[model samples]
Target: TPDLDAIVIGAGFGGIYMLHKLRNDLGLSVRVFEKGGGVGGTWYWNKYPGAKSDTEGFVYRYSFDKELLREYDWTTRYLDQPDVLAYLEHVVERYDLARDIQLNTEVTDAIFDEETELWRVTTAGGETLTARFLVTALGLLSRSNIPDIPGRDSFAGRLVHTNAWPEDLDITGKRVGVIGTGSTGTQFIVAAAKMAEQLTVFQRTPQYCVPSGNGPMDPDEVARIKQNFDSIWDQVRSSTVAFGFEESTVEAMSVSESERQRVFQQAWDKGNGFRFMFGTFCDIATNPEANAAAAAFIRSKIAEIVKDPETARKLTPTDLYAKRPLCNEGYYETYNRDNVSLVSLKETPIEEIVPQGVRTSDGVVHELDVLVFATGFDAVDGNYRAMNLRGRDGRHINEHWTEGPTSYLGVTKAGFPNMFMILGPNGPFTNTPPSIEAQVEWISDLIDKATREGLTTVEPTADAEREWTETCAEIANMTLFPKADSWIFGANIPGKRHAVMFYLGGLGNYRRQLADVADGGYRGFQLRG
Candidate 1:
């Protein structure tokens, strides 16, 4: 009578891994739905120029498949979208997971039926399926959040969002205007500077970007990594950020000024924003003085790189360098190009989108042949809140997240029975793959236990969700991450409630907590047969 044991949404890393665990391991009937024509959820859509995983190539993938880990090869230090997508496709083919995965299928609505303890999911095509477990692998950054600027549709130019970048569209020898300066924006600007006839960047907030140190993987290094794979993974599984680096234990304040500068210089030269923030000195994100020092160091570096003083000043961010630390090859130097121009929105905000281009408050229309909005996603709970999701008593997901998203263990919501969220709200704010793996494995294990125990309904208590939220907030408060207006705090979206959306507690700690809860016989959850 049951259509499937599990209906997993989004065939990305999380979805693919979940399917592998449930279908291949547990021998459960599982079906995965992906909105795109292919798998690799994030990589599939974000095929914008220079789109690459910020995390290093070696650690950007699943650590579960030992043989795959040993054999899989990457040329670059960071895996670009194509590399990531190809790798994901390879995994699907190797595992033969495509038969159960339905591409170009979007789940429009899902409602939990109390009587059967199953999720009734309706797709875009109006087909409904019933499943015992409903797991959402909907990525953290899938929901494209194009800000509602005035006269948005009036623009006659080829309007594009980095989220849905067209494959055939070429920007060579054309007037290009890019909005927003986040990760995607920065990456696009670097590539566009080289190709575009005139590249204009609409900078809302200045960023502190470290060098990527991105290059070809050394054969000697690769061999060494393969030999020490076990230790590397163990270290990764135990680390804070889990970007495959040893996070610094040294406090910035503890070091002498000369020593601090020397250390910062080394990390700066080494590249990677994560390595800068986490690897250089531990206190950079916690202590204000330490953060200021780090921020000042980058600003000075930017000042040296940019030829113009005004442009350098515009490029320097006055705020805490606490927002997702950015890494790039030549973002600051791009401004030096005669073809590239910078428009600081703070100085003159965009008034509206004119017929030809963007109109600023200064009554100037920056004419463009192509306009790219690199504005990021609504994040965490955005995709979840988009659907007509109803839980117990027909209570909407919007209603539950009225004050922002909350979840117990970042997997189970209190009111949603037999449903799990991978990379959900209040999950570990570590590297995406490792965090995804952690949540996926935990959820899969929980499901396995439930199936074995013949549990009909399993959901966390409301009190547990509340406690988890408090814990996340408490830990977040200890750090400087909350001070900045960031997507991590739901600050990017216009009307979205700003709140702590991640567990700032280390990944290793999170793993232990997950273990403790499971060992405590899945404490704080109502398990009934």
Candidate 2:
């Protein structure tokens, strides 16, 4: 049998769109290997009790197809896990993407053959296949990162990870303890606050979370968007970030103290998640004074919500701003619940996980019937690192990213020819779907052109990879994002090098750069015949 033109890994948003573009637009024969039982990748796997899109559902989707936009309208402002999955399933069915997608199939290993200029891929079930181009649509946040906690295996209770939430496990009357207070943890607590008999949240370093004014989507708003959705989508693409919201051009320093408070009040009242932080003030991520003001405002909100001074103090973040700013629905106020409890890991730290429940350093065992690990993922490089992938000269992807991930333009890397990644290291850290759409289209165009022009291989050079890494660092170091040890900077994971994983440069700038590279005959990449 002839080798496939391309092989896409994962059946997530990126993979589905990538496969569609390849087979339909470019007329390339491609196969997709998804580990899940069906499509929807992240949405398919993560079915936690309170699972929903943090970003607004409408903008979080594909903006490429007019027909898709016209037919399927999201149900909520932020769609839940089931609804999100159903949408993707619909996409697969509508585009006839199911036939080529091998569900329950995992590509365990892939190696590029220099002589043949093809990728020899081996599946987990011992089936081997070959493809000219290899694309890992392995979503950035796909791989789950359960901490190497002692006695985790010995825990007799029904343990669950938010990433792999069990559908049948009901925690209605159970005493539940959720570990990690990131976005996932916050959401779980908020949702489970009333549901659980007792909900104990284990907080490490307290993260600053704004209120998500998530509610019923207005029909008028939906109608307006649906009416001129195409123009709005175009305008969104031209913006610095991927969203259509107009960010204030005002710097934080320029405003008076009273005016600053008033401005923040408006943004807070609007409550569009982290977008409020960066959109309200231009200098918040860069200037310390500006960041402090924003942080102070957030602290005030915490104080206003939680009646207890000590609890509010514990929740108030003083360290840094712009570290994956979160928005929640009744998160801070959840602590006021008589049934809810907060365990500060910093003060009354967890010593170990006993069979009964979580044990603090003081030997206090908080017994729980169910334990939820909302600890989040290893992030950008996790999915790629878990795979057994090698390139020419036996260049291992893991070895290449030993000091953390390095990629040329976040799409391709050196030594790995014909291999491309979406939402990998050094990519834009904005509304992801917009970035995903751009990257998928770019890679496809590159592949199509290469095939049409008789080119056998396309990969970034070592020099280009090096330059891009340094550029990412420069952009991050200029801001306060790296000041705090966030996941994007690899700060959450122990012994991991502190580094910036995304381009801090705006979407507009990033797109222009991509265009410039393309216009320059795809400069920084090595094309071979």
Candidate 3:
């Protein structure tokens, strides 16, 4: 007999919602396993300095519960880690999710039993649990990607990664050295520079950052939005990316230069990351001229912010800006401080890490009291591959994804019975929260139908997986997304296959297709009793 009908890994926003849907909506016995001591998942653990959501606070939440949305009050446009965690805790208590959650336990391995069509999950404590349905709410960016730096352990001073930040740790009056120039790195540098006595940033690649312009939400504005919450949800649901924003019906290059600037500037001022790309451009992703015009505007903004002309030039990204649009407040201005310095890796890359500090290729060793690695994760397939997932005839998930993660709509994997994934590879990259919610909902509905009809297993056909993989590649090839060597293409991770992992065909279209598949008797899936 199964310990529970379903066991969800990771108790984040996605996991919590999926648990509720499985238990309350489908009347299934569900349990959630979280590695953290309590709920909040990533928000619970990532308490690093200046850690906040890139997306606006108003729309970064679950839109399924009207009461939850109406009651919770967000302080700023962008919520910091503490506020987001508190909000999640409130939801956990409100929904009485604690009973169904197993916290402070890490799931070591999950193997599918081909004969019984059940998943046997084993935790770090050697405790075994069985579940008919095994759903992974493991977030895309959950795993930390700490590079193997020589003499890292030999360093006697403090070292930290943004993902594995020390609790109650303070770096005040310390000389800090930060590595990497990704989004997390940018946020850490901005916050660290303020507190550290001396801060030296090691930039391998300078990211194009725009001002987030974060501020307190006006009471009037809050009230106005609260009144139209229903309409807002409807609008977001109808859109491709699943966020409440005005869709641009026109192309970027089709408009006049003045008009294009006006549109691009409006999106720049709007503060969100990818929304700017969709503001006035259908061909912005495909047309080089359209992308270049947008990139030029951002480069001009960077030049205006950085005081040193040479530093500004080094910081200005020569590549396309749409690849990774950094959202920050006071990030560029932080460079103006006397104590803060930026090292260009392009000119002099790091050769090795010495005991005291980093040694550049030019044979210069810069000493530091502390080192921070803000390097991003091996996204999408990182966490999934971390698991010792074995399917029919002992075929492991790592082996299946040896080339890259392949999925049917990013939710179901071929040859994996009674397994479902939320926000897995091939999912919509834009508007992550809503896309996650949609996936959870769809999985819940499928599980409910299967249970009602006495179905024990549901797996995607091998042909279906191949077709979906091709569709994902086809859509990605049509756009300019796959052209760049970005994390979106798995370029950052060494030896990791470079593929456009996300479904770029738009959120609304993807949602409709998923619904159609479900309605057509779960067409691609093999349902067995």
Candidate 4:
């Protein structure tokens, strides 16, 4: 017999919700294991200076719980690290979720015994436990990716990756150097620039950023959301990206120049990343001319903000803006400060890190007291690939994912029995929270059915996996996403297969596909007793 019906790996938003559903809705014996001392998967650990969410807090939160939504108070539109952590802690207490969560415990290994059809999980402290189902809610962006820069260990100064920043560390008067230009990098730079005596940013590729225009949550707005909660929730469920933005059906080039500018300007004023691109035009990602216009508009905005023409030009992104748009409050304006400096890695690439500081290719030595690698995560397949997970007949997950992760509707792999991946590769990128909820709910329902039917194991058929993999690839290739080296294509990680990993298809359609499969008696899966 299994120690528990289901064992969840991470206690972040995904794992917490999964546990609640399993225990309350499905009546399953579930336990959660978190590496951190408390709940808040990513939020619990990422407490670095200037760390906050890009997504608005109101929509970023769980909408499944009505009472939770009604009662909880938010200070700002976009929540900072501390506030997010506090909110999560409140959630843990409000629901009495702490009792089921094992804190400060890490899972060292999870081995599936074929004979017993059970997973034997070993924790870091050598304690062993067993579970029939392993629901891995291990977050998509949890694994920190630190590049193999030469002489990285030789550096005498303190070095920290933003993802793994210490909770209590201070950087009051230090000269800080950050290397990266992604979303996290932007947030870190903006925050660090405020406190650090001198802040130097190393830019590899620039990202198009729009203002978040964040402010204290208005009571009227909050009340409006509460009043129309059901309708708003339905809209979010039906929409493409899931943020309740006004969807554009008109083609960009089809409209007049004035109309196009008006649409783009409106989305720009509205705030948020995807809104500036996806919210403006229906074919922005597909049409080059339309994308160029949007890119030019943003470049002009950057020039207007930065005083130094040379620094502004260096920071301006020439690439298509739709690739990786960022939302920030005062990221561009921060560059205008005297203490902040920008280093273009393209011009003077990083040579090595000496004991004193970093030396660029141009022989310019940047002496810094602290170094922050705001370099982004390996994204979709990073966590699963790093774990050395081996399935039947010594077939490892990494080896199987040599071509990239192949999942049946991004839910389950063919050989990995009873293993469900939340927010796995090939999932819908927009409205990630709702997409996550859909997958978790569907997986939970499947588990319930399997248990009621006395099925010992279930997995997607090999044929289904192949078809799904091809479908994901086909959809991705239709867009310009593969052209850029974005994390969505696994380009951030060295030697990783470069392919668009997310299902570009809308969340609503993907949900329907999952539902159809379920209605067809779980068509793609093989259930065995």
- TM-score of every prediction relative to native: 0.99, 0.98, 0.97, 0.97
Give one digit per residue, the lDDT tens place, for model 4 in 1-529: 9999999889888888888888778888889988888789888878787778777777777788888878877778888988888887887787777889998888877777788888777888889889999888888888888999998888888898987787666777888899998888898888899899999999999988988878788888887777777787787788877876666788898989898888878877878887887788887777788788888878888999999998998999888665666888898999999999999999999999988889999999899988888888888887777665666666778767878877889888888889888887888877567888899899999999889999999888889988888888888887777777878888888887887678888877888889999999999899999
Instruction: Give the winner by lDDT.
Output: 1
Compose the digit string of candidate 3's lDDT tens values, residues 1-529.
7888999998998899999899887888999999888798778878789899887787888888898888888879888999989988888888888899999889989998887788999998889889999999888888888888767777667788787888867889988898888788888888888899999999887767777768899978888888898988777777866556777778787779899888878887877666666655767777888888877888888888889998787788897665655788888889889999888989988788777888888898888888888888888888889888888887989878876898898899998988999888887766777888789999999998889999989999989988988988898887777876768888988888997688887778788879999989998999988
Task: Note each model's CA RMSD in angstroms.
Answer: 0.9, 1.3, 1.4, 1.4
Q: What lDDT is obtained when candidate 4 is compared to the true structure? A: 0.84
2 or 3, which is superior by lDDT?
2
The residue-by-residue lDDT of candidate 2 on 403-434, one tens digit each, is 78988888898999999998879988787788
Best by TM-score: 1
Residue 140 of candidate 3: its Cα lDDT?
84
Q: How far is candidate 3 from the true structure (C-alpha RMSD, Å)?
A: 1.4
In model 2, what are the clashing residue pairs, if there are any? none
- Residue by residue across 1-529, what tens digits does model 1's lDDT show? 5699999999988999999999998899999999899999988898788899889888999999889988988888988899999999999998999999999999999999998788999999989999999999998889998888999999998898998999888999999999989999998999899999999999999888989988899977877787788898899989999999999999998989999999999998888989999999889999999999999899889989999999999999999888998998888989999999999999999999988999999998898999999999999988899899999998999988888899998998999999999988998988888888888888989999899999999999999999999999999999999999978899999899999899999889999989999999899999999
Q: Candidate 2 regions off by >4 Å?
A: none
